[PDB]
Swiss-Prot record, chain A:
Biotechnology comment: Co-administration of salinamide and rifampicin or salinamide and myxopyronin suppresses the emergence of resistance to both antibiotics.
Known role: DNA-dependent RNA polymerase (RNAP) catalyzes the transcription of DNA into RNA using the four ribonucleoside triphosphates as substrates.
Subunit-structure text: The RNAP catalytic core consists of 2 alpha, 1 beta, 1 beta' and 1 omega subunit. When a sigma factor is associated with the core the holoenzyme is formed, which can initiate transcription. The rRNA transcription and antitermination complex (rrnTAC) consists of RNAP, NusA, NusB, NusE (rpsJ), NusG, SubB, ribosomal protein S4, DNA and precursor rRNA; S4 is more flexible than other subunits.
Family listed: Belongs to the RNA polymerase beta' chain family.
Disulfides per UniProt: none
Post-translational modification: Acetylated on several lysine residues in the presence of glucose.
Protein name per the record: DNA-directed RNA polymerase subunit beta'
From Swiss-Prot, chain E:
Family, similarity comment: Belongs to the RNA polymerase beta chain family.
Swiss-Prot/TrEMBL catalytic activity: RNA(n) + a ribonucleoside 5'-triphosphate = RNA(n+1) + diphosphate
Organism, scientific name: Escherichia coli (strain K12)
Gene3D superfamilies: 2.40.50.100, 2.40.50.150, 3.90.1100.10, 6.10.140.1670, DNA-directed RNA polymerase, beta subunit, external 1 domain (2.30.150.10), DNA-directed RNA polymerase, subunit 2, domain 6 (2.40.270.10), RNA polymerase alpha subunit dimerisation domain (3.90.1800.10), RNA polymerase Rpb2, domain 2 (3.90.1110.10)
HAMAP family: RNApol_bact_RpoB
GO BP annotations, alphabetical order: bacterial-type flagellum assembly; bacterial-type flagellum-dependent cell motility; cell motility; cellular response to cell envelope stress; DNA-templated transcription initiation; intracellular iron ion homeostasis; nitrate assimilation; regulation of DNA-templated transcription elongation
Protein name as it appears in the record: DNA-directed RNA polymerase subunit beta
Effect of residue 679 to M: Resistant to antibiotics salinamide A and B
Posttranslational modification: Acetylated on several lysine residues in the presence of glucose.
Role this protein plays: DNA-dependent RNA polymerase (RNAP) catalyzes the transcription of DNA into RNA using the four ribonucleoside triphosphates as substrates.
DNA sequence: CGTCATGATCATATTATTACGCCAGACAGGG
DNA sequence: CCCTGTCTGGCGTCCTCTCACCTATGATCATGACG
């Protein structure tokens, strides 16, 4: 289901900006989980370009230079 | 503070008369099983000096 | 925070940290001068419960309070839920160069333009007017330009008509439901104090004119003007993204 | 209420009729309040489960898509083929029933001219490429999505479709609500699906299956009526036959589950000991 | 006959039903409840005496001392209401209490006290209520709102369906005390019976039945019948009553008297029961399998062994029968445990019980209350006697005892406030009866189960909580001190009592700030039945059913006036005729329809007495005697409407206005509006604003005079008489002699309230509406208030409206208004803003208010005087200086940027000790001079009335016609006159005169003391300067106007005069609405209001034509009489033949701007009457005039509807919502802009807008929308330099609030970082 | 000159429950 | 150990506007007045 499918992600910032933050941060704390900003909402959090519109061309350039 | 009354009096219902005591030292439903040792050890303490908060 | 009454109604965090430091200093002094055998235990229980009040208040049994019934705020109450850093400060922010007023009709508009007051257009577009003043040479410094546009002399309205001209703004109705709820127009200066908004466009906002209020935003940078012209203009979004039905149905 | 409001707003309404109108009106207002309260949270959960899905390639390179047929509740056809297979890239290339003659190639966006050419030839089921059966790792390719809705052409490489999808589903959540036989209408050939049928003594066709679905194939290939047929129902017709309109072709009992047979012979009792397995209950006022 | 202000402008009245009970005083809930609260009340209850006699006498901890109670008394307040609102104090009265201390001796508490002491003591300050029904808490006029909550008593609810997911319903029986511990009996799906106390842990219910000292034999004696088995020579025979066998299938062949009655395999029919009870069959024969599962009742003991044969409440087996049979017992008592009739719920409950006697039950109850501690028999007895059985901790009220006896079918409605054994046993009996299938459950929303608290009862409860805290202090200082040396004011202190009552009146969830911008808004905020607050439900949790109108709101709570939004149906408003019962329920009037005739006696029915009887509907036709003219009449029996016969009715409604409230009974043609639009119309009629010159409603309901007079905005005459001096400030009435006291000679002075600030920043004015020399009657208006006119209620103004689409400028709901409206200054409302400036006390020294100010020149300081404070009258702009203030740094008060105004009033308050500057001494001399002149004029005016009394007495009995005015006037007593009533009266007037002399001396000294003294103020403030700006806001495109039916709208274009559609007479229409709002939003009442308003103005135009031509009074009398008859059988029936040729000219002077027409709510003017009144004027019959165009000058096809609609300006203006921000201040903890308008803030770019920009491809717009424009401080300073240099470019950076997220997550044990 | 009384200023955390509701997943009760 | 009930954790629209409220009580020390 969509609330369990959104809480079960490989990215703890999305699952923290959604429902319960305590359980998500403790599970990602003891697991040592490592987000890589992976899409839209983590980049809205951290203050950079969305990888959707014009920022999609910017992210293809940034990933090609990796 | 140390008190000694639990035979057939008010075990836990009337702390004192009034004043304003925090509680009955909590630590479980009833007070921690106080044996006959610490009481005798606290019969003549404060064998140091003024110490204080400097 | 001061409340301007000689006293500080403190935040809840300083109360919590103050309780932990009181209880910890009393526990250091009680471990100093020796604990009465089975005694150095109640104080550590109190310290553990004060830290559990600080890290997440209310998760352990009955929470604490300062005044009077409401439980006060720990750290986990600053990260979680609404009124916390994820949903109130980081995903949706308060934004400079913005304003809001009450909407109205004005049917003499083309559908890519909206009426917007002279006072709102003068207060949103201030640094543009400062730049045009010290680029045309009508004020030496920034302070003379600020006092000119505070007095509203007879030349700054020409400056304002020369900065509005090809510069979109974003109009926004307050319950944004779908993506047509934010659109971009080219302003027209209006004597008055309301936002004249094209009628056909109000099919997409679900907006009547019985007291609705809309908010205008300004795109500062150059790429944002191009995105509010090529992607978000009111002439481009004539089809809904839910189907192929037109959204410019005459009401 | 069994005594209705026999007065309109041009005339008056007396006190009780206006009070009953107030029952209805305040029920509606409280519905709208708590309705908005649920609808906003539905939009939130959908844009937070989608949130990430960006059109990130241009061709995945698979074939398996879903099968688009017009929906048939059992009356008029509710949603036709033109309004479902509008603008979505075909999975397997559609061959007209002049078999080994291709009508559309297998990567053609079906815009309005192609949909009219589908409606003319009465195409059965245009198997079409869906987003759920894609192959792109970490995203969704462009051809499996379809037309860029709100525009005309194919979807651009990049437009975040999870967010527009979740808003398009949750946005009409304000408008939503919160709190014997088979009768035919049209005329055509008769189709049966998943049926185990046998011949009775009367000459009809009786059924030994719950999973029977009756269909009405029309003159050009598609289906305009579908009926779930119960277990042990009795048909007045058979498969592949021809009927007329207004003709009830099936009948059963919704109260009784029939235990009808296949072979013709005597009936005996096996592992049926009286007093324990079967009891003696005489029907008193009837006799049988 | 008519009162003299009803001969000014007599309102035309349609309406058919002759009234029998007039509208009561609309503020009777507040005033009657608080009069019930504070009054010297003997016989104990109710009031403050209930608290003072339930918490006192405080007796000590066995120290033989006792602080008992005598009486109480409230002194006068030190400040009257006006000084209290000006200065800012509470409007309180000191509560003096006479307490007594007695101190008993040793060995005899039944012996003599050695010493008593009775004395006066000070405790608390309870705030009084003003005559308007409001409180003044800190200078702001507040209202405490009535609460609707659950009635104390038993309540048998049924948890239907949802539990256990198998359809098996539960049944719980909540006993709701008024004060104490709750008690919930319930079931479970195993059909056991479970008690619980205050939602705590769950126990089996019979554990409390042992706690009331019942043995188990007595419990089964109570809760079951008995079945008798007699062992008489053959198979252990049975006593059988066949009523238990109604439908049971026997296991054998029941025969008796040598006759087969019942066969095996069949059941016992009812006729077989008749056979067995007709033949009187007693003993039948049972097999050995019949008592295989019968449950024994009581204990049987064997006499030989002394052991127990079988325990109580045990099924019987073969060996138990073999044991008790050979022990000598012939009688066996068992129980009847049927499937339908009587389940063994008590028996299964006793089988789950581990307890066995009273002591173990009390131990288990003491253990479920306080967990994990050693019980003792004394502690368990004390706890269980202090849960339910003590006068202290448990108290049903009289309401509670009434519901508890009524819902258990008792007789006496009087009982004790505590429970007993019979009470709990009757609760369990009724719960088992409801489970058995007979009897019904009780719904919640039924208004026989919803009590209404008010101001008096809630203030009593908060005062009682203050008293139990102070008895928790006195039980302290009483047995821990030396006696006798102290007095009972050293013990009891006034801090918890005053803190409790001041916290309740100060900040509660029901003591709320009065919405005061309208007389209607006052009088409908005071009448509010809120469901929220303490003891009730909450908005964001519940629910569905409580937000719905129950069938018994009819005539108690209004169905259509409620706020839409998050709390519909919780903020209910009480109806018009709805009183409050003796206990607290709602009651409403009816007319006792005896067998044929509707008797005109009123008769108040409650909510449960209404259900049993049958009530006729309000508008049923009856022919002059009371005989119902139909033979089927629409009625309602038990919450359900139907059609009944002519003379089975028992009550009729009083008047047809009683379902609605006073908010939604000023709507004309209410029966034509759909209920949603009537709701929105009533709510916006509450939200109006007072205009400059309020006019009148042409189409009213006649309910305007009740709302105007029965509120407190007009100056109602107390004693009638003759006016002597009218002024814009004061009004002097000379009291008539047939209304007048013998002493205290008496001519009344009404000091009107001129321009002052309301709570919603409107302008609460009072204008005198009487002439000079004019007679006034008792109970009559003298001075109109805000939004009143001649004693009526004029909220908005009535304007010429046309329904036509006009070139798109009224597209959705918009309104298009001619410039003729704004030229006439007719919506030009007057607002008043209060701007405060305090002189605080900081370091480097105090502040300066003087005008020697740095950084300023002549152009600022020209509008200030020589001491900083702006003048009174200086018309300022937005951003000048009002008060100049410099700290040890300019911090002068300024007009906030945007508002103009004219400074009308300046207050200066000085903390005592501080040097008064020259302007504070100017205000002190000014107010000394004003109060000096005012009290001297009090003495002069009352002395003039006294000398007029002396002249009136000396007309007879030793009259001196010439000698009276030769001597000075103060000696009119020693003239020639004997010892009569006249020299006695002159001596009494000399007593009054010398009293006025010495009273004037002492009161002028006290008033100089009040002006000269300082005022107690904030900690560390020198002086407070308050300045009142008086803005005059006219009208503009963007304001919100609305009619009285829900037709809202933002006025969209203020056209010129010429563009308006005019008709073939010449007059332009004022407002052009939109027709398309009528068929969807079904408010068809506004079109009937429009047509009847055009009829009213047609009659007004014909009066203006017959009067402008200077015609004699005969033709005016003719036409006014024809316009006042005009209808069916109506109520008005006026005649102008008793107005005498001078009032008719003045009545026509008041009718020339239109003729007011009353239209009551559900008994209004029908269509044919509107047509006949439009035929009296020469208007067209259909109401539609053909209208020309203003632009083209050519005719609109298909003639359009014009008329007059009464439209209201709402105070959602557009220069209070409009806001704009380039770059202002920034918040401190997260570097984002501030929120709001007063704080110069920016609009919240919320979360759904972020989703809507992700939904496009706009990426740079969102990046600057949440990094550059909002948060990143170096990013936004780089942005500001780049914008003023022409380079549109952003240097992004990081949001600083994300660094705040890192510090808050990092301040835990969590280590968040940023890699690479 | 000394003692007593009154007034003013400064100093810390119960004072001596009841009217939401659903879902869900773990913890444990019964068998 | 295999259900099956209980328990306690989560969650419950957006944007804006207005208003109030944010101790008082007790104890100790100092000063003044009276004996
Ligand atoms: Mg609207
Ligand atoms: Zn694909």
């Amino acid at each position: 289901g969509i609330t369990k499918a959104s809480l079960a992600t490989e990215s703890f910032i999305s699952a923290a900006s959604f429902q319960e933050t305590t359980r998500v941060l403790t599970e990602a704390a003891v697991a040592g989980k490592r987000d890589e900003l992976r899409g839209l909402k983590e980049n809205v959090i951290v203050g950079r370009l969305i990888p959707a519109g014009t920022g999609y061309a910017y992210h293809q350039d940034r990933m090609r230079r990796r | 503070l140390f008190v000694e009354f639990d035979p057939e009096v008010i075990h836990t219902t009337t702390i004192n008369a009034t004043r304003g005591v925090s509680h009955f030292v909590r630590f479980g439903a009833s007070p921690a099983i106080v044996p006959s040792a610490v009481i005798h050890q606290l019969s003549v303490y404060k064998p140091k000096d003024i110490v204080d908060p400097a | 925070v001061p409340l301007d009454g000689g006293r500080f109604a403190t935040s809840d965090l300083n109360d919590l940290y103050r309780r932990v430091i009181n209880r910890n200093n009393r526990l250091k002094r009680l471990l100093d001068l020796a604990a009465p055998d089975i005694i150095v235990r109640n104080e550590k229980r109190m310290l553990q419960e004060a830290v559990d009040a600080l890290l997440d208040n209310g998760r352990r049994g009955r929470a604490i309070t300062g005044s009077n019934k409401r439980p006060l705020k720990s750290l986990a109450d600053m990260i979680k839920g609404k009124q916390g850093r994820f949903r109130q400060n980081l995903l949706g922010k308060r934004v400079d160069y913005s304003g809001r007023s009450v909407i109205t009709v004005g049917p003499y508009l083309r559908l890519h333009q909206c009426g917007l007051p002279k006072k709102m257009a003068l207060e949103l577009f201030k640094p543009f007017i400062y730049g045009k003043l010290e680029l045309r040479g009508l004020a030496t410094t920034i302070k003379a330009a600020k006092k000119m546009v505070e007095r509203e002399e007879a030349v700054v309205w020409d400056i304002l008509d020369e900065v509005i001209r090809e510069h979109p703004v974003l109009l926004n109705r307050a319950p944004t439901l779908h993506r047509l709820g934010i659109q971009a127009f080219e302003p027209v200066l209006i004597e008055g104090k309301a936002i004249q908004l094209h009628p056909l466009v109000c099919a997409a906002y679900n907006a009547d004119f019985d007291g609705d209020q809309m908010a205008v935003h300004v795109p500062l940078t150059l790429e944002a003007q191009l995105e509010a012209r090529a992607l978000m203009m009111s002439t481009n979004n004539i089809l809904s993204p839910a189907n192929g039905e037109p959204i410019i149905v005459p009401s | 209420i069994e005594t209705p409001i026999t007065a309109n707003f041009r005339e008056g309404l007396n006190v009780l009729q206006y009070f009953i109108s107030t029952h209805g009106a305040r029920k509606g207002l409280a519905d709208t309040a708590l309705k908005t309260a649920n609808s906003g949270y539905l939009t939130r959960r959908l844009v937070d489960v989608a949130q990430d899905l960006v059109v990130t390639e241009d061709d995945c390179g698979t074939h398996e898509g879903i099968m688009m047929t017009p929906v048939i509740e059992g009356g008029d056809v509710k949603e036709p083929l033109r309004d479902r297979v509008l603008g979505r890239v075909t999975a397997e290339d559609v061959l007209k029933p002049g078999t080994a003659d291709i009508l559309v190639p297998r990567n053609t966006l079906l815009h309005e001219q192609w949909c009219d050419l589908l409606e003319e030839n009465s195409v059965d089921a245009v198997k079409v490429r869906s987003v759920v059966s894609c192959d792109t790792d970490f995203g969704v390719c462009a051809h499996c999505y379809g037309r860029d809705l709100a525009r005309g052409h194919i979807i651009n490489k990049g437009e975040a479709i999870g967010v527009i999808a979740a808003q398009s589903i949750g946005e009409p959540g304000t408008q939503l609500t919160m709190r014997s036989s088979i009768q035919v209408k049209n005329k055509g050939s008769i189709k049966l699906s998943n049926v185990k049928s046998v011949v009775n003594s009367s000459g009809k066709l009786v059924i030994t299956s719950r999973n029977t679905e009756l269909k009405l194939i029309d003159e050009f290939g598609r289906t305009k009526e579908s009926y779930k047929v119960p277990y042990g129902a009795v048909l007045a017709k058979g498969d592949g036959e021809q009927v007329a309109g207004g003709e009830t072709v099936a009948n059963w009992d919704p109260h009784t589950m029939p235990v009808i047979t296949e072979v013709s012979g005597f009936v005996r009792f096996t592992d049926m000991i009286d007093g324990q397995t079967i009891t003696r209950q005489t029907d008193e006022l009837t006799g049988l | 006959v008519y009162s003299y202000t009803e001969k000014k402008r007599i309102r035309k009245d349609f309406g058919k039903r002759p009234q029998v009970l007039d509208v009561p005083y609309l503020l009777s809930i507040q005033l009657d409840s608080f009069q019930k609260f504070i009054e010297q009340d003997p016989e104990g209850q109710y009031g403050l005496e209930a608290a003072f006699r339930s918490v006192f006498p405080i007796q000590s901890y066995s120290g033989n001392s006792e602080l008992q109670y005598v009486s109480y008394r409230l002194g006068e307040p030190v400040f009257d209401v006006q000084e209290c609102q000006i200065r800012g104090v509470t409007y309180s009265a000191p509560l003096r209490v006479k307490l007594r201390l007695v101190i008993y001796e040793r060995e005899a508490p039944e012996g003599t006290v050695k010493d008593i002491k009775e004395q006066e003591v000070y405790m608390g300050e309870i705030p009084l209520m003003t005559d308007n029904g409001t409180f003044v808490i800190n200078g702001t006029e507040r209202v405490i709102v009535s609460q609707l909550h659950r009635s104390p008593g038993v309540f048998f609810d049924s948890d239907k369906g949802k539990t256990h997911s198998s359809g098996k319903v539960l049944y719980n029986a909540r006993i709701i005390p008024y004060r104490g511990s709750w008690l919930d009996f319930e079931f479970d799906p195993k059909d056991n019976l479970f008690v619980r106390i205050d939602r705590r842990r769950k126990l089996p219910a019979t554990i409390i039945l042992r706690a009331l000292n019942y043995t188990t034999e007595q419990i089964l004696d109570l809760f079951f019948e008995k079945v008798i088995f007699e062992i008489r020579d053959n198979k252990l025979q049975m006593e059988l009553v066949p009523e238990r066998l109604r439908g049971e299938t026997a296991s054998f062949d029941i025969e008796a008297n040598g006759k087969v009655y019942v066969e095996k395999g069949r059941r016992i029919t009812a006729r077989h029961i008749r056979q067995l009870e007709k033949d009187d069959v007693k003993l039948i024969e049972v097999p050995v399998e019949y008592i295989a599962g019968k449950v024994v009742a009581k204990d049987y003991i064997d006499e030989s062994t002394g052991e127990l044969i079988c325990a109580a409440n045990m099924e019987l087996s073969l060996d138990l029968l073999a044991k008790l049979s050979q022990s000598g017992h012939k009688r066996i008592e068992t129980l009847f445990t049927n499937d339908l009739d009587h389940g063994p719920y008590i028996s299964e409950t006793l089988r789950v019980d581990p307890t066995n006697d009273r002591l173990s039950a009390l131990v288990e109850i003491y253990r479920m209350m306080r967990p994990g501690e050693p019980p003792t028999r004394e502690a368990a007895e004390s706890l269980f006697e202090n849960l339910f059985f003590s006068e202290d901790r448990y108290d049903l009220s009289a309401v509670g005892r009434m519901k508890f006896n009524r819902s258990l079918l008792r007789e006496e409605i009087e009982g004790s406030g505590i429970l007993s054994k019979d009470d709990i046993i009757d609760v369990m009996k009724k719960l088992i009866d409801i489970r058995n299938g007979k009897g019904e459950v009780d719904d919640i929303d039924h208004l026989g189960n919803r009590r209404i608290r008010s101001v008096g009862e809630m203030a009593e409860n908060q005062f009682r909580v203050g008293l139990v805290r102070v008895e928790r202090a006195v039980k302290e200082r009483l047995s821990l001190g030396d006696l006798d040396t102290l007095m009972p004011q050293d013990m009891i202190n006034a801090k918890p009592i005053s803190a409790a009552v001041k916290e309740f009146f100060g900040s509660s969830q029901l003591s709320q700030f009065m919405d005061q911008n309208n007389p209607l808004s006052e009088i409908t905020h005071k009448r509010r039945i809120s469901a929220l607050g303490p003891g009730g439900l909450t908005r964001e949790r519940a629910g569905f059913e409580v937000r719905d109108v129950h069938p018994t709101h009819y005539g108690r709570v209004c169905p259509i006036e409620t706020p839409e939004g998050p709390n519909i149906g919780l903020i209910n408003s009480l109806s018009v005729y709805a009183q409050t019962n003796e206990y607290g329920f709602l009651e409403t009037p009816y007319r006792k329809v005896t067998d044929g005739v509707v008797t005109d006696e009123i008769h108040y029915l409650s909510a449960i007495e209404e259900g049993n009887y049958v009530i006729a509907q309000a508008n049923s036709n009856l022919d002059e005697e009371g005989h119902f003219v139909e033979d089927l009449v629409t009625c309602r029996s038990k919450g359900e409407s139907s059609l009944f016969s002519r003379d089975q009715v028992d009550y009729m409604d009083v008047s047809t206005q009683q379902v609605v409230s006073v908010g939604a009974s000023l709507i004309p043609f209410l029966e034509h509006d759909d209920a949603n639009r009537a709701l929105m119309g009533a709510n916006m009629q509450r939200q109006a604003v007072p205009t400059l010159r309020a006019d009148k409603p042409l189409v009213g309901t006649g309910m305007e005079r009740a709302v105007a007079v029965d509120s407190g905005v007009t100056a109602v005459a107390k004693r009638g008489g003759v006016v002597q001096y009218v002024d814009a400030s004061r009004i002097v009435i000379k009291v008539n002699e047939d209304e007048m006291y013998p002493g205290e000679a008496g001519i009344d002075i009404y000091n009107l309230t001129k321009y002052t600030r309301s709570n919603q920043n409107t302008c609460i004015n009072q204008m005198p509406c009487v002439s000079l020399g004019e007679p006034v009657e008792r109970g009559d208006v003298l001075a109109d208030g805000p939004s009143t006119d001649l004693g009526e209620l004029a909220l908005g103004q009535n304007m010429r409206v046309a329904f036509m689409p006009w070139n798109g400028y009224n597209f959705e709901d918009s309104i298009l208004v001619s410039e003729r409206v704004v030229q006439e200054d007719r919506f030009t409302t007057i607002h008043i803003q209060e701007l405060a400036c305090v002189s605080r006390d900081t370091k480097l020294g105090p502040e300066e208010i003087t005008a020697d100010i740095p950084n300023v020149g002549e152009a600022a300081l020209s509008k200030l005087d020589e001491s900083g404070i702006v003048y009174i009258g200086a018309e300022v702009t937005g951003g000048d200086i009002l008060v100049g203030k410099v700290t040890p740094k300019d911090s002068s008060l300024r007009v906030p940027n945007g508002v103009s105004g004219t400074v009308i009033d300046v207050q200066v308050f000085t903390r005592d000790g501080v040097e008064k500057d020259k302007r504070a001494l100017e205000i002190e001399e000014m107010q000394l001079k004003q109060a000096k002149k005012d009290l001297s004029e009090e003495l002069q005016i009352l002395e003039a009335g006294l000398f007029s009394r002396i002249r009136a007495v000396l007309v007879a009995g030793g009259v001196e016609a010439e000698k009276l005015d030769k001597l000075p006037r103060d000696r009119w007593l020693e003239l020639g006159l004997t010892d009569e009533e006249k020299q006695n009266q002159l001596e009494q007037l000399a007593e009054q005169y010398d009293e006025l002399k010495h009273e004037f001396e002492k009161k002028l000294e006290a008033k100089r003391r009040k002006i000269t003294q300082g005022d107690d103020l904030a900690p560390g403030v020198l002086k407070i300067v308050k300045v009142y700006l008086a803005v005059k806001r006219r009208i503009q495109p963007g304001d919100k106007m609305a009619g009285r039916h829900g037709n809202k709208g933002v006025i969209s274009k203020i056209n010129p005069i010429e563009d308006m559609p005019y008709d073939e007479n010449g007059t332009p229409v004022d407002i052009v609405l939109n027709p398309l709002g009528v068929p969807s939003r079904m408010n068809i009442g506004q079109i009937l209001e429009t047509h009847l308003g055009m009829a009213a103005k047609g009659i007004g135009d014909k009066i203006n034509a017959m009067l402008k031509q200077q015609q004699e009074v005969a033709k005016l009398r003719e036409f006014i009489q024809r316009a006042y008859d005009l209808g069916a059988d109506v109520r008005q029936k006026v005649d102008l033949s008793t107005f005498s040729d001078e009032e008719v000219m003045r009545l026509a002077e008041n009718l020339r701007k239109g003729m007011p027409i009353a239209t009551p709510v559900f008994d209004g003017a029908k269509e044919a009457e509107i047509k006949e009144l439009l035929k009296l004027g020469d208007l067209p019959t259909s109401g539609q005039i053909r209208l020309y165009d203003g632009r083209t000058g050519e005719q609109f096809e298909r003639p359009v509807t014009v008329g007059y609609m009464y439209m209201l300006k709402l105070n959602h203006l557009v220069d209070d919502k409009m806001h704009a921000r380039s770059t202002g201040s920034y918040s401190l903890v997260t570097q984002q802009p501030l929120g709001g308008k007063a704080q110069f803030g920016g609009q919240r770019f919320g979360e759904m807008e972020v989703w809507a920009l992700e939904a496009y491809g706009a990426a740079y717009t969102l990046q600057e929308m949440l990094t550059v424009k909002s948060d990143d401080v170096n990013g936004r300073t780089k942005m500001y330099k780049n914008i003023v240099d022409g380079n549109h470019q952003m240097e992004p950076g990081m949001p600083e609030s994300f660094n705040v997220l890192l510090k808050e997550i990092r301040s835990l044990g969590i280590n968040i970082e940023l890699e690479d």
